Design an enzyme around this catalytic site. Structure first.
Site, short mmCIF file in Angstrom:
data_model
loop_
_atom_site.label_atom_id
_atom_site.label_comp_id
_atom_site.label_asym_id
_atom_site.label_seq_id
_atom_site.Cartn_x
_atom_site.Cartn_y
_atom_site.Cartn_z
N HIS A 1 -7.17 -6.00 0.42
CA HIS A 1 -6.04 -5.35 0.59
C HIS A 1 -5.26 -5.78 2.00
O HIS A 1 -5.77 -5.67 2.99
CB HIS A 1 -6.40 -3.69 1.06
CG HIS A 1 -5.36 -2.87 0.52
ND1 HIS A 1 -4.93 -3.00 -0.86
CD2 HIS A 1 -4.80 -1.69 1.11
CE1 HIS A 1 -4.01 -1.63 -1.12
NE2 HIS A 1 -3.89 -1.24 0.10
N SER B 1 0.69 -1.27 -0.05
CA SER B 1 -0.03 -0.01 -0.17
C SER B 1 0.89 1.35 0.04
O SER B 1 1.68 1.65 -0.96
CB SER B 1 -0.85 0.31 1.32
OG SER B 1 -1.87 0.89 1.10
N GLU C 1 -8.98 -5.86 -4.37
CA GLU C 1 -8.18 -4.79 -3.72
C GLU C 1 -9.11 -3.62 -3.06
O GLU C 1 -8.88 -3.00 -2.13
CB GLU C 1 -7.62 -3.91 -4.60
CG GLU C 1 -6.21 -4.52 -5.43
CD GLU C 1 -4.87 -4.44 -4.45
OE1 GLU C 1 -5.00 -3.83 -3.48
OE2 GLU C 1 -4.15 -5.24 -4.68
#
Lengths: 528, 528
Positions: free
Chosen positions: A434, A199, A321
């Site tokens: 994620h 990230s 995601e």
């Protein structure tokens, strides 16, 4: 026991021996690499740590940097595993170094982790970033730093000497100069340094590629679910100023010198408590600015201009995601139900997922993501909005970056991570959200106190091997070894990538190519 | 021989007996239903045919109306089968009536054909529209008219009494009033009249649904590859005027009275010779105008407002609608080679296929039709541009029409025609082009002098049965008979349709739904 004392430029350290079902590892946790950025230093670039007499204790993680704490769901693993697990403090510029036991006797290659967290949260000390399993299993040296987040890391009043911005990125840099000067002492090879992050850590690693002063300090890169060309990863000079001013206002401050002077007197918690009202989902208030300085132009500009000859890169994404972001603002959503939204809900959600664009831009998103045989199917609407958020924020920026790099000299490998952990506590419907690859890369399923399955254990090992091969040689593939199915480079033309999964590698073409063309080629014309 | 004399309101007629492998049929070819529109009548609505003494010979087709002749490829079947096969003349308002032998003894249901041809060409007399096989095989009555085309049919100087426009449509109407008054005499049922047409014939039938004065004159409708809401099927008042004025200019003419006066003195061939330079592919110079009169508002407006309760409709398309149009203007194309175009060629072709739209509109077409794994594949580029032309001109207008009708009271069935005739002379790569279903509906493969296969013969028969069942009962399905796989109505929600093919019926959902959403919902916003 001999292996737990080490001297570095600043002085002496004592480490701790950690266990692993396969055998022990030496850790040096909690090493200071900068002066505490406190008082008048709040908001300034870091300065290098002064040397010390005596032996510094490095047997325990240091303080987490000041940050907002997620509290939507007390007691919940899915949420709490990302929250701070040591006391908060502005005194937080420490790093950690795991190394094998026995110490290695040639220079060995160094993996440096940069945690994600939207640039507003994160700590090198989270259970899920424990370096023990990876260092044990692949005899590499592992390093992680803490770096300032939120206002303390990325508040910026462009072109003032008092809050220039990007100091969190400078923190990271300082740790990388540090690795250059001291990893040798742990048996580490300063001429073989591979960065890797998830990230906002991935965005970060990205920004290091594009900053001439950081290019000196490493040799390879791995960007997991993130890129610096994100619509969330950077911000314009005016917007940064507007955000800084509003924070000031909200804590009763009151000219730049006077503003940052006043801010400097507020208790760190007071700043944190107002971070969120300065701004949507997947948007964060204090992120890197484009100042002309740490970045001489936009990430997009620099990617396009850049020469990437003699550079290897591993990039990738998870299956789903966008999914977990949806319960942070999208109407109709909740983790505690199936989130079967209606179409009205879907259209309103698109304005949340893709904030401030022309209605003309929104429509086009809606056309592109609707299935017209099933324009009202709640489950399809859920998956689609998920994709909108996913593609826009993560998959499309990554694909652009990946392609532009291969086309311009870089050797690039690419993956999609497609295993749902057997232990995940987020709902089924979110798929593989994620961040949920990280524990497999770090070898966490080997910890016997945790409840992973057998195949899960094997898989984690393959993953650690890919990463470690990448680190050693610039190629994930098993140094000299067919059959073990092969993993081909990703090029702009063939756009080849692999599925990481309990099943053996499968090769595939195009990282969501139809949708990326929309975000990357069409949509721009029409904000404009 | 007794059955070949018939009296109608205007007087007496003599017909001819035609053969069919299954047995004979009675035809009355060449019946006048209007005064010749010659001299001062050039450009005016038709007037009804005056009665006659004696017996009019109806054993032979009358004259083709004046029209441009395709001559790109002398000797070529693919092209020549559409060209005039009798002498050209302004004296051309004749119709034809096939009826079974022996004559039927109850009123039987009447099929009326309206030929296509872009409104600039076509004749009731083409070999491929021979009514003998359909009337023999399904004992219906069949009628076809000629109607004025090009300038003589659709030149318009809006709101003048001297060239009001839409006179070709009025011609068709007059033939339909005629069928009302006289089909009874051939054993035909004036209370069961089903219209059917291809290309501009389909657009025509469409316009009859939306014209209150024509709704009286039939009960059902069949639109094959065409609709009146096409971007080619109608034209605005100003554009019609501009096109009329330019034709005038080009033949040296010179106020509306004076303009049409001068035009009235030009030899018909002189007008024809300049039709093409007044305007691209799939665009024609003299098409129906929106005058407020034959159509009180745009086809789109009227479709949306309309009530279609108690009306059955059959609509459909061929596999490859756009393909043959490409060798009429698209760079890189030729029928005598594989037409493997390059990408530059593809982009330039899109401006030809979709003429005068913003570059912004063109881009969006290019995104939507490019495959981004294979952005440069010549064969894929060929197929795509084909689809662009197909979808835009035929499939998307038809789908819009179909959906809006079902939603508003009409019972609607839908097909895709997917058999390439074994005898086709256009190249393989064109697939199943525009018009190449017609010969199967008309039963042509039964003619022994032609070289169709056995399965082809059977297939033609199924097709004639579907059409005839539709005509008799408003439902193509075999009146009372499962298994014979069923053909479901097409609704706005489930969008169900069938493949007509040598294989048994297969049901499918969505007539190019993703692409139609682009043409029908997105694109408008962005011309605007």
């Amino acid at each position: 026991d001999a292996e737990l004392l080490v001297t570095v430029r600043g002085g002496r350290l004592r480490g701790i021996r950690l266990k692993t079902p396969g055998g022990p590892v030496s850790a040096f946790l909690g090493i200071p690499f900068a002066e505490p950025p406190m008082g008048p230093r709040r908001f300034l670039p870091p300065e290098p740590k002064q040397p010390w007499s005596g032996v510094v204790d490095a047997t325990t993680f240091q303080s987490v940097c000041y940050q907002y704490v997620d509290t939507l769901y007390p007691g919940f693993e899915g949420t709490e595993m990302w929250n701070p697990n040591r006391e908060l403090s502005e005194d937080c510029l420490y790093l950690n170094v795991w190394t094998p036991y026995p110490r290695p006797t040639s220079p060995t290659p160094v993996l440096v982790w940069i945690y994600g967290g939207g640039f507003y949260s994160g700590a090198s000390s989270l259970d899920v970033y424990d370096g023990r399993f990876l260092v044990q299993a692949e005899r590499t040296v592992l390093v992680s730093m803490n770096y300032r987040v939120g206002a303390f890391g990325f508040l910026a009043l462009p072109g003032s000497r008092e809050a220039p911005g990007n100091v969190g990125l400078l923190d990271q840099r300082l740790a990388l100069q540090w690795v250059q000067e001291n990893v040798a002492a742990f048996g580490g090879d300063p001429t073989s340094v591979t960065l890797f992050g998830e990230s906002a850590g991935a965005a970060s690693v990205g920004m290091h590629l594009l900053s001439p002063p950081s290019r000196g300090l490493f040799h390879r890169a791995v960007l997991q679910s993130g890129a610096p060309n994100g619509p969330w990863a950077t911000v314009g000079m005016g917007e940064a100023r507007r955000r800084a001013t509003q924070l000031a206002h909200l804590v009763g401050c009151p000219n730049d010198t006077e503003l940052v002077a006043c801010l400097r007197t507020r208790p760190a918690q007071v700043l944190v408590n107002h971070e969120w009202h300065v701004l949507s989902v997947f948007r964060f208030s204090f992120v890197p600015v484009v100042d002309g300085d740490f970045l001489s132009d936009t990430p997009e500009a620099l990617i396009n201009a850049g020469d990437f000859h003699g550079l290897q890169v591993l990039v990738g994404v998870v299956k789903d995601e966008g999914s977990y972001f949806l319960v942070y603002g999208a109407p109709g959503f909740s983790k505690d139900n199936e989130s079967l939204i209606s179409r009205a809900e879907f259209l309103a959600g698109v304005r949340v997922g893709v904030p401030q664009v022309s209605d003309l831009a929104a429509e086009a998103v809606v056309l592109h993501y609707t299935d017209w045989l099933h324009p009202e199917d709640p489950a399809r609407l859920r998956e689609a909005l998920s994709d909108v958020v996913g593609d826009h924020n993560v998959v499309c920026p990554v694909a652009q970056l990946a392609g532009r790099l291969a086309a311009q000299g870089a050797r690039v490998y690419a993956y999609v991570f497609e295993h749902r952990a057997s232990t995940l506590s987020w709902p089924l419907w979110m798929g593989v959200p994620h961040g949920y690859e990280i524990e497999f890369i770090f070898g966490i399923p080997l910890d016997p106190s945790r409840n992973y399955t057998a195949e899960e254990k094997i898989f984690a090992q393959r993953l650690m091997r890919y990463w470690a091969n990448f680190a050693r040689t610039g190629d994930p593939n098993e140094p000299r070894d067919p059959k073990a199915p092969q993993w081909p480079p990703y090029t702009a033309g063939a756009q080849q990538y692999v599925s990481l999964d309990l099943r053996p590698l499968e090769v595939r073409r195009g990282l969501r190519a139809q949708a990326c063309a929309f975000w990357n080629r069409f949509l721009p014309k029409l904000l404009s």
